[PDB]
Design a protein around this ligand. Structure first.
Ligand code: CLA
Ligand code: CLA
Ligand code: CLA
Ligand code: CLA
Ligand code: CLA
Ligand code: CLA
Ligand code: CLA
Ligand code: CLA
Ligand SMILES: CCCCCCCCCCCCCCCC(=O)OC[C@H](COP(=O)(O)OC[C@@H](O)CO)OC(=O)CCCCCCCCCCCCCCC
Ligand SMILES: CCCCCCCCCCCCCCCC(=O)OC[C@H](COP(=O)(O)OC[C@@H](O)CO)OC(=O)CCCCCCCCCCCCCCC
Ligand code: SF4
Ligand code: SF4
Ligand SMILES: [Cl-]
Lengths: 80, 737, 67, 39
């Protein structure tokens, strides 16, 4: 599976979660930002590596980072 | 239903680029803005969401395009009248080559003003304008000047019509949606009445000076085209059917007109063109059939057809609800109409190219081998580009204008439901065709290289005779008298007959079909199938696939959906257009190479007075075109000697473009093999260097987008290759002689 | 030039066929208001369409008979 | 006054300057051709 990490520059705009087409990310409560929410990735075994969440992230040097690792049927997006 | 003054005419919005796009109107921040601007100009469906204003913009743009075409045609007539030798060529066709471009003496470029005949110095034009002008009955420079002035006036009229139909009086949507009347108005109108008027022009004007110039009358001794219509006695002097007037037309006695409206077939053996009586009778029959066709659909009087009802009645046990809904698609989506029109117009331009060489309709065009090769290749390339654009706009319709709720169990929905079966079978066909044509060539190269010529695929070895094409050629040869009793000669002498030998040169002979023709025709079948596979997979999978199920949300033109799922770069419909462009380029390069080699080897050449023909490349196509090495050595290497030994002569410009296209193709590979991350980091280093001397621009420079990098790559690739082939073909065929 | 008159008068088989096969006859803008038994029964554009079709089959018939 | 700024757009100025420089070069060649050095 691929690794999705969320760093402490997250400002809780939820745009990475909205952009994710495979339901990898949620928003959990937090205290480090004014929105008081941070993105989380409990479902990285369903992550395909499309990096739409990275494209959606507005913080300069994005607070969400996707690292392509071990390749599975789910991660290669195979319907067969 | 016409609006009154919708858009005011002001000069202020000309000075603010990016007014049409909301994001572009904020101003430039990155350089991509500029590259977005030209990219977003004509995408009218994206700027405004209402179909009405999109139709207004399209109508005014069509008028502007017609104005541009009229400006081009007016320039052609002006260059044929002032800076040409149409005078001089017309009295002596086969001593003087056509030339309609005169180039100033500057920096040594006056060498390109070559000796073409009759004390003239200019570029030998190969477009065939002189042969069409002779076929229309043109005989003076002043009339060509009048045609140029009329073209300028019609271009001004088109510009005024576009301004009027966008800014002053503009139609509504149901004017555009009334396609039942539009098809009647285009069939019985444009095509039918245009061909009726041209048949009338043929019979009255183009036929007399043509037949007098074929008889031997000097062009100054033929007075002027209007004095024939001033005095009808000249027609009865020349065509004696003009004695009963219009009486046999209305009294079912059309056999009186079987003196200027004939069914001869073949070619005129003074010029090599088609018979003008044959073309006039053809145009008259086309006119009558088109008038009949342009009364099919109900427009305003309750008589006719409903295209919706015709479509809805066509359904079967295999096809569910059949053609239900296609009227709504083709009346609401401009892109769907553009796709099907581009497909049929590209196929038509290719049909024009294939029909024009074997039945040359213009006098002395056939013996001008440069003109024949140029016209064939130009019309082939135009047709192939339009077919790629058809695949493009089919994918664009699929992304933008398709609606699933309004296409349930019709033909289009069932296409989308069995696209896997379609594309997989087309994939298998493409692999089968690639093997059983190109691997035949590879087999032949290997067996010839191994010293086993008896094991090759050839006429002198294992034979692949195109027996069905030979049988159809035989049936066309026994057509005129058995299955075409009133036809005198065959439809074309390429099917079988005798060689027309206008001047010392050849115009047409029986084009025989052997093993090499079989091999190259299956190569054509293969390459067309692969281009079709690419474009049809781009259309059928523009919305979704098993890889990207939400591709329609990403749009028509997007680079990728990221490195994930293994990697999804070039999944969009636009990237299928990008790949199909290269494959169409490959297909048409092979088609025109086949044409050039076969015409130089088995058709064109010099006829002896005894009746023998010495061909240009002496019949090498039967033994050399079966190997890749033969194509490399006897076609490319041998015939490129004219384009590379052109320096210091009038053909040296064809040398320069032969280099120049070789540049651009290679330049294209920079954009085609690389990616924008490297170029963006390099740009960062150069911006740091600009920051050091305070020359940093306010608009920040960026690398090109991934889509734009692919677009620049494919554009430069096709441009360089086409310019190379153009230079090679023209310097070969201006030196064939 | 007399038998062709009888052939392009027996062309009225087109009128007969259009009487019993045209879906919409009396609908047009100008509909030939003095309606009668067999000359202007359905309307002006129906009559125009049937006379054009009659001329088409009349031309076909006369050039088929004239071998 | 929008036409003045429409001419002031970058492609119009760069094409006008290119035509001006090309005219200068073509005129200097057609007056005095064939210069490879300083005589
Ligand atoms: C759209 C098609 C088209 C094309 C490709 C050309 C191309 C050309 N024209 Mg031409 N022309 C055209 C339409 C066209 N014309 C029309 C519609 C008219 C009628 C108004 C003319 C009237 C015309 C004249 C009167 C002359 C040319 C000349 C020329 C040549 C040099 C251009 C020049 O002076 O740059 C000028 C560049 C700018 C003004 C900028 C060039 C081959 C010249 C030529 O061949 O020299 C003998 C020349 O004297 N043209
Ligand atoms: C002098 C008369 C005049 C004036 C003041 C305007 C002014 C305007 N037009 Mg307009 N138009 C004109 C003539 C004119 N047009 C003509 C003759 C046509 C018919 C082709 C049109 C067709 C037209 C359409 C279809 C649209 C406009 C739009 C607009 C508005 C936005 C400005 C614009 O298009 O960006 C400035 C653009 C340019 C300066 C582009 C120049 C032309 C490029 C280079 C292509 C060249 C082809 C050309 C159109 C025709 C051939 C030229 C000829 C020499 C052969 C603006 C109010 C648009 C609108 O409503 O805005 C939202 C719009 O959609 N016009
Ligand atoms: C749009 C096409 C067109 C046009 C404008 C004309 C125009 C003309 N034709 Mg004509 N013609 C045409 C197509 C056309 N023809 C075709 C397609 C045929 C073949 C069936 C003929 C066969 C024809 C004959 C046989 C004669 C004319 C004649 C004439 C002239 C007098 C007719 C008249 O006033 O009544 C006139 C210049 C008559 C004439 O005097 O010729 C100059 C004449 O005798 N035409
Ligand atoms: C009847 C013909 C026709 C019509 C009406 C359209 C209309 C349209 N096409 Mg389309 N297309 C056509 C033919 C046509 N095309 C053909 C034949 C092809 C195959 C090559 C395509 C491929 C194509 C693609 C791939 C795309 C479109 C797009 C579009 C839309 C916007 C156009 C645009 O961006 O303008 C602006 C156009 C440009 C900036 C291109 C200019 C640069 C070209 C490549 C230069 C070509 C080189 C030139 C001939 C010689 C260079 C000389 C130089 C050395 C000086 C519009 C609906 C685009 C779109 O947005 O879809 C909705 C899109 O993505 N079309
Ligand atoms: C000369 C270069 C070249 C070659 C050989 C191919 C080959 C192929 N391309 Mg292709 N392509 C190329 C350049 C080339 N491409 C370029 C430059 C582009 C960029 C635009 C593309 C883009 C492209 C696309 C977008 C598509 C293809 C497709 C295809 C396939 C067509 C089906 C076919 O012919 O199967 C038969 C295979 C051949 C004719 C290849 C040669 C086989 C030789 C003669 C036999 C060898 C014998 C034996 C196996 C040797 C083994 C040795 C032993 C020691 C092991 C085929 C695999 C299409 C495809 O997959 O459709 C099915 C497709 O959709 N290509
Ligand atoms: C299937 C192949 C084929 C093709 C392409 C043609 C093509 C042609 N035939 Mg033809 N023909 C064929 C088979 C074919 N024939 C056969 C098998 C026979 C029987 C031996 C004939 C007998 C025949 C005759 C007798 C004549 C033609 C004629 C013609 C020419 C124009 C008229 C026409 O066909 O309109 C098609 C029109 C119809 C089918 C209408 C028929 C009448 C119905 C009942 C109403 C055209 C070149 C004519 C000609 O010489 O023109 C140059 C002509 O007079 N054909
Ligand atoms: C009972 C009435 C009748 C009769 C006996 C004929 C008889 C004939 N018609 Mg005819 N015709 C008629 C009604 C009739 N027509 C009507 C009503 C129309 C209008 C729809 C036509 C329209 C028509 C046309 C347009 C043509 C004929 C032709 C012919 C001749 C046949 C040539 C041939 O073998 O075709 C060809 C047979 C084939 C099998 C070829 C088929 C190939 C195509 C491309 C498919 C023959 C004399 C042809 C003629 O006279 O040529 C000189 C011709 O071109 N007819
Ligand atoms: C020494 C004086 C002189 C003379 C007699 C000419 C004479 C001429 N020039 Mg000219 N020219 C000159 C200096 C001169 N030039 C200089 C110094 C420049 C640079 C600013 C130019 C830039 C120039 C251009 C850009 C053009 C001319 C053109 C022309 C010709 C058409 C007349 C005209 O004004 O336009 C004419 C033969 C035009 C032409 O078409 O030449 C045939 C043309 O396009 N000239
Ligand atoms: C080169 C010439 C000599 C070789 C010819 C070889 C012919 C090849 C085999 C026949 C193809 C049959 C398709 C027609 C038969 C056909 O139209 O059936 C008719 C049927 C539609 O039946 P309905 O009665 O539902 O149709 C009502 C219609 O009005 C549509 O609603 O269509 C289908 O079932 C679609 C499936 C086609 C599946 C076949 C795919 C074709 C792939 C092969 C294409 C090859 C063309 C080669 C020649 C150019
Ligand atoms: C044989 C000769 C060579 C022909 C080869 C051409 C291959 C066909 C390529 C078409 C793809 C483009 C269709 C739009 C697809 C598309 O938009 O292109 C892709 C690219 C921008 O696409 P992106 O996806 O980056 O756009 C993002 C936007 O969609 C959102 O802002 O556009 C350009 O490259 C802009 C540069 C145009 C350069 C402007 C220079 C001026 C040239 C105008 C002169 C033209 C000729 C005039 C007549 C002489
Ligand atoms: S890479 Fe794609 S699938 Fe993975 S978390 Fe990001 S958006 Fe979701
Ligand atoms: S290589 Fe380029 S086009 Fe391919 S997935 Fe990565 S970013 Fe997208
Ligand atoms: Cl060889």
């Amino acid at each position: 599976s691929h690794s999705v990490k969320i760093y402490d520059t997250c400002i809780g705009c939820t745009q990475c979660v909205r952009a994710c087409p495979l339901d990898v990310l949620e928003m959990v409560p937090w205290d480090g930002c004014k929105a008081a929410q941070i993105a989380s990735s409990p479902r990285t075994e369903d992550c395909v590596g499309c990096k739409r969440c990275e494209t959606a992230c507005p913080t300069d040097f994005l607070s969400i980072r996707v690292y392509l690792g071990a390749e599975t049927t789910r991660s290669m997006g195979l319907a067969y | 239903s016409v609006d009154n003054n919708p858009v005011p005419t002001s000069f202020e919005k000309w000075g603010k680029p990016g007014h049409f796009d909301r994001t572009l109107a904020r101003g430039p921040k990155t350089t991509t803005w500029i590259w977005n601007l030209h990219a977003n100009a004509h995408d009218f469906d994206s700027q405004t969401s209402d179909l009405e204003d999109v139709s207004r913009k399209i109508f005014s743009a069509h008028f502007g395009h017609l104005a541009v075409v009229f400006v081009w045609l007016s320039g052609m007539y002006f260059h044929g009248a002032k800076f040409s030798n149409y005078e001089g060529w017309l009295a002596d066709p086969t001593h003087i080559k056509p030339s309609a471009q005169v180039v100033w003496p500057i920096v040594g470029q006056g060498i390109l003003n070559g000796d073409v005949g009759g004390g003239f110095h200019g570029i030998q034009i190969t477009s065939g304008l002189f042969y069409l002008w002779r076929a229309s009955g043109f005989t003076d420079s002043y009339q060509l000047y009048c045609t140029a002035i009329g073209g300028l006036v019609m271009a001004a009229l088109m510009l005024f019509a576009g301004w009027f139909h966008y800014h002053v009086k503009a139609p509504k949507l149901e004017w555009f949606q009334n396609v039942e009347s539009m098809m009647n108005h285009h069939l019985a109108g444009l095509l039918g009445l245009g061909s009726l008027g041209w048949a009338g022009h043929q019979i009255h004007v183009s036929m007399p000076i043509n037949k007098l110039l074929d008889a031997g009358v000097a062009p100054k001794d033929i007075p002027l085209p209007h004095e024939f219509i001033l005095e009808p006695s000249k027609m009865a002097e020349l065509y004696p059917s003009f004695a009963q007037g219009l009486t046999p037309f209305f009294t079912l006695n059309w056999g009186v007109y079987s003196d200027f409206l004939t069914f001869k077939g073949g070619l005129n053996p003074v010029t090599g063109g088609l018979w003008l009586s044959d073309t006039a009778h053809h145009h008259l029959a086309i006119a009558v059939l088109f008038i009949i066709a342009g009364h099919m659909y109900r427009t305003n009087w309750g008589i006719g057809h409903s295209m919706k009802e015709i479509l809805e009645a066509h359904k079967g046990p295999f096809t569910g609800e059949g053609h239900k809904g296609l009227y709504e698609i083709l009346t609401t989506s401009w892109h769907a109409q553009l796709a099907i029109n581009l497909a049929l117009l590209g196929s038509l331009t290719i049909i024009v190219a294939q029909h024009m060489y074997a039945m040359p309709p213009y006098p002395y065009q056939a013996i001008d081998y440069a003109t024949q090769l140029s016209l064939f290749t130009h019309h082939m390339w135009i047709g192939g580009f339009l077919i790629v654009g058809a695949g493009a706009h089919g994918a664009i319709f699929m992304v933008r204008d398709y609606d699933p709720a309004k296409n349930v169990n019709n033909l289009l929905d069932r296409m989308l439901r069995h696209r896997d079966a379609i594309i997989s079978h087309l994939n298998w066909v493409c692999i089968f065709l690639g093997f059983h044509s190109f691997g035949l060539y590879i087999h032949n190269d290997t067996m010839r290289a191994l010293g086993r010529p008896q094991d090759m695929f050839s006429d002198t070895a294992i034979q692949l005779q195109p027996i069905f094409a030979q049988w159809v050629q035989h049936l066309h040869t026994l057509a005129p008298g058995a299955t075409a009793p009133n036809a005198l000669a065959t439809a074309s002498y390429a099917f079988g007959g005798e060689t027309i030998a206008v001047a010392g040169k050849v115009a047409m002979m029986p084009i025989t079909l052997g093993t090499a023709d079989f091999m190259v025709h299956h190569i054509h079948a293969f390459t067309i199938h692969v281009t079709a596979l690419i474009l049809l997979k781009g259309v059928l999978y523009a919305r979704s696939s098993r890889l990207v199920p939400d591709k329609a949300n990403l749009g028509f033109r997007f680079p990728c959906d990221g490195p994930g799922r293994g990697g999804t770069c070039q999944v969009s419909g636009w990237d299928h257009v990008f790949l199909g462009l290269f494959w169409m380029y490959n297909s048409l390069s092979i088609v025109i190479f086949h044409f050039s080699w076969k015409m130089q080897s088995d058709v064109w050449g010099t006829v002896s007075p005894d009746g023998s023909v010495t061909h240009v490349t002496l019949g090498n196509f039967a033994q050399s075109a079966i190997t890749i090495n033969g194509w490399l050595r006897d076609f490319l290497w041998a015939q490129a000697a004219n384009v590379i030994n052109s320096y210091g002569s009038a053909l040296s410009a064809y040398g320069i473009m032969f280099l120049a296209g070789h540049f651009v193709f290679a330049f294209s590979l920079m954009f085609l093999f690389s990616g924008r991350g490297y170029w963006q980091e390099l740009i960062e280093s150069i911006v740091w260097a600009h920051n050091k001397l305070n020359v940093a621009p306010a608009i920040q420079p960026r690398a090109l987008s991934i889509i734009q990098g692919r677009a620049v790559g494919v554009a430069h690739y096709l441009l360089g290759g086409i310019v190379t082939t153009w230079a090679f073909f023209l310097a070969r065929s201006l030196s064939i002689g | 030039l007399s038998v062709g008159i009888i052939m392009c008068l027996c062309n009225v088989f087109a009128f007969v066929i259009g009487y019993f096969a045209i879906q919409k006859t009396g609908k047009g803008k100008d509909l030939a208001l003095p309606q009668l038994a067999s000359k202007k029964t359905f309307g002006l554009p129906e009559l125009l369409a049937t006379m054009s079709f009659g001329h088409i089959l009349g031309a076909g018939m006369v050039l088929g008979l004239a071998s | 006054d929008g036409l003045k700024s429409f001419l002031s757009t970058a492609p119009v100025m760069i094409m006008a300057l290119l035509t001006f420089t090309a005219g200068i070069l073509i005129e200097f060649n057609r007056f005095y051709p064939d210069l490879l050095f300083h005589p």
